[PDB]
Design a protein around this nucleic acid. Sequence first.
RNA 1: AACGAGGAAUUCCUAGUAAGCGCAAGUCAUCAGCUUGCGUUGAUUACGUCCCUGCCCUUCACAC
Lengths: 103, 229, 51, 11, 125, 63, 62, 94, 206
Amino acid sequence: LVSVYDSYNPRTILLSINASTHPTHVTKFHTQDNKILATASDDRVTRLWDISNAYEPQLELTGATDYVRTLSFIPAAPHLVATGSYDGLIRLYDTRSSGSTPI
Amino acid sequence: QKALPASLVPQAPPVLTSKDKITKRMIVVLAMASLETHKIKYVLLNCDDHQGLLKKMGRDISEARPDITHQCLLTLLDSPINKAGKLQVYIQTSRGILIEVNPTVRIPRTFKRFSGLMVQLLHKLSIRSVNSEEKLLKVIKNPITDHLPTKCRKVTLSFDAPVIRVQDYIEKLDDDESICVFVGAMARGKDNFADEYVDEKVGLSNYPLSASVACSKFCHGAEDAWNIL
Amino acid sequence: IPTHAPKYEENFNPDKKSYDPDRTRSEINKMKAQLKKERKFTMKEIRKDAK
Amino acid sequence: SLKAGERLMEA
Amino acid sequence: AVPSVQTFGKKKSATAVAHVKAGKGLIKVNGSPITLVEPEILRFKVYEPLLLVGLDKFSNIDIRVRVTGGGHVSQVYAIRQAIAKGLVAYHQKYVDEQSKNELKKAFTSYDRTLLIADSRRPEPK
Amino acid sequence: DALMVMPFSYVLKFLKFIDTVMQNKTLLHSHLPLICKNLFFIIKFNHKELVSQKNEELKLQIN
Amino acid sequence: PVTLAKVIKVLGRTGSRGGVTQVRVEFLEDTSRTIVRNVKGPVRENDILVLMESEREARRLR
Amino acid sequence: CGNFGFIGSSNGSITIYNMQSGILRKKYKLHKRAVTGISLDGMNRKMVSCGLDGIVGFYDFNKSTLLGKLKLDAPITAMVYHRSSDLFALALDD
Amino acid sequence: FEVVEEFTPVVLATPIPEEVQQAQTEIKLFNKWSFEEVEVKDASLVDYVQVRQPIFVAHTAGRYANKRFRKAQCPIIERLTNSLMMNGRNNGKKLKAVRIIKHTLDIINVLTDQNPIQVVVDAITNTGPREDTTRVRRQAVDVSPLRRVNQAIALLTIGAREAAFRNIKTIAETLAEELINAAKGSSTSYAIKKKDELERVAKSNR
RNA sequence: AACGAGGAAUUCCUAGUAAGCGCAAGUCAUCAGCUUGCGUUGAUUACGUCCCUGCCCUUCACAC
């Protein structure tokens, strides 16, 4: 489960997302765009969530054959997303396109 | 190469109640249920047991049959769909009483013990488990519409209406939306009990169907439609 | 789904008062009702006689 | 029953 | 003598007395600054006059408001009514009447209750 | 109040009825004041819609 | 597509059911065109109704 | 109305005072040369100015906005405003 | 061209927070949301969804129950706050409703960067049922704009209240979710589903 | 054992109203198993119609 709290207000919980049944090791907000939140889990799919729509991922990147524990957003390239798995492969994705297959 | 769920242990599906209104469901409303109580002790009025008594109340003994309501509840609750937790049952007594039937309840199989439970239910307005953890049968406030899911299709069982494949009907229906089937437990009468709530009426077979066989036929179609098995 | 059995009393009579696990508890509750009924009736009678 | 105006429309 | 005016605002049992004089922009309620008025959620309500006509007009006057009776909300409404009436009266007496007319126009355009009492007298039916 | 309730489509029907009455001179003079009051009220109430219509047959009837 | 019509007259003595008001509305798209409709809520002149159907003509609902 | 007094400066600024209290209320700065004429209509809505720079400024007195600006061939020397007819004549240097 | 109205800096002997001075510049709801850019998208709802007069706080103490159509002039935010307090246990507690609405607008701005007042207006505009039924069976009739506004507010508030009746979510967050979903027009919002069911039933008996 | 906001039926209610909160007094009848005052916070929905149900009324110009 992914929990979004108001910083400096631990009591309030704004949004709660059940990203996957497996552990969710990485949860990182997109730098350029505020609404979209990225999540990578041991399910090996790095879902891109939207704060407004928490019921379904906006995009569900796949293709990693191992645990994905690393996620990075490239500055000046909001469409690009970088993920690194224990495969030893760093996979780069383009969110503008259909996605789900690394460029 | 989609990965497996983290835990594959069998998990009991949630018990679906009136409080939850989003989950897809197939609701059966056994309208025109003949369930009445009267002191001789109080006994559920029956078409054969109490004929002279019902004559004194002036009601015709043709429509004094709670066994039909007993029959439908047995096949509905024992159907695999209920065992899958996708079905909840409501009962609208002819007098105008609305009863909620929790999917967990295990009604007695013998009709005599069934009658003893209803007189308890109508007077005490609720039935609790032997272990006293939940309320299985509860009387609720009319109309049925508020209790029903917010987005929901409504239909009735009509002999005169066009015959439809129940399996096909559920398939073409939406996913977030739920389906309510108003079954007439009455032995005979005009099929207009639920006309105020329902928007369309459908038939299941060319030949006449009882309340019990009809609902059993309906549910089995849903199981194939949703692959409940 | 878990399956539970309904709890009901056979030959139920709502006019008849609820069965109680403890006989002494029922017997005193039986009787506190009797004392209240008798006290209210006699008080009504003595008032009416006085009037 | 029918009201004035409603009757006239029928006529 | 220092030019000064006195006005009353009223809401249910709450009554506020405002004294407005020549000064340096000192607004106080019950001996404390206006910024400390409570409840905080309704504080901007009592700010409504100050903001509607602009703080520049108050830079040349001192206002002292004393409030008694009623509850929190009625006290707030009494304070704002008293402040508005005091400002209008001071501009009437010791400043041009043109500014008086502008102040009255602004207050009436925003909320007439700032100047005229809101009295819910019973009306049988 | 009865005349106002009629939709416009019935006003054209009403205007065809009065035209038929005009040929029968016996009826026209028998109820001439009544015919005038109803006709003028109908024209006044929905004058705007009547003038908008471009029906040539309508223009001849009113003439 | 749904049309918008402005109420020009609130008819009276129509014999309508309780809470239902019969009104006359002119289409914003075509000001000349008018249609008689039935309204459920409180209605006055110059307010705009969203007509889903523009061909049905109102009848008394008793 | 007799409430406002308008002063035109040789440096081009128009200052507006209140006659009752003598307090400066507004200051208009459009002209860069001397203002040789100021006038306000009877309705206290539209205000007109002229200066040696040759421009005729039209202001909305109540909203304090520049309605328009008109340039003439020669410097303007004097103004007379007729309030009833909303006509004003300007004596140019030509 | 310059017009000068202040010729000396204004400093008051009583300190005032600067934010209150930027509020002097313009009236904003809770000193945080501007009314300038808010418009009612649906033409019919105009003249009944009142947003033209900016207000600092929802509390107004106005008299809107006197005449038949005074409720139209009441600010829409205040009508939402008033509808928020029901069920008896909340009756008379308007300050708590104001706080809930403040928190809800903050949540709405957080989740979606749009102006929260615009989101509220969009939700009310969308969730107003345009065609309804009257019992005779049923017969289809039109709905007045005032009834549309009333039913929209009632549906939104009832959905928000029921969603968090016995749930870990609080009233503010569920109200924010309902408002955002209704503004989008998605079927997730309870009010949108109720409106769609009403209009569908009216179409059936048309 | 009992219970987790209360079924069927039925009643009342239009603005400082419904509802919530507390503080006083006990004023020759009534009231303390309580009664009457006082202030505080304060809404939703209608303010139209005779369609249904009851009660009621009717059968000095000009213009009609």
